[PDB]
Amino acid sequence: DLDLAKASATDQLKKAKAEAQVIIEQANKRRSQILDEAKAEAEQERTKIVAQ
């Protein structure tokens, strides 16, 4: 029974590590998206104000 208990606990921990890593990668991709949206909006505003 100890074999089963050890294996289940350790693979549960492995699942947690993988899930945390992909959670953080989703955060990183969202970071890129929002930052590029801000950059595009700012550049659009700046170009139109300087022409005006």
Partner: protein, 52 residues
């Protein structure tokens, strides 16, 4: 962008100073040569030989 426009403001001002000054002295050369007078020329000489 806003500080950029306030730099551009000074850039616009200086060029107009340059234009008006150059064209004004261009007119002044004509005006002064046409307005030469022998007594004034003698007074220029009488000034410089008085300080020399």
């Amino acid at each position: 962008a806003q500080a950029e426009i306030e730099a551009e403001r000074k850039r616009a001002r200086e060029e107009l100073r340059k234009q008006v000054a150059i064209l004004a002295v261009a007119g002044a050369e004509k005006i002064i040569e046409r307005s030469v007078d022998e007594a004034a020329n003698s007074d220029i000489v009488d000034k410089l030989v008085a300080e020399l």
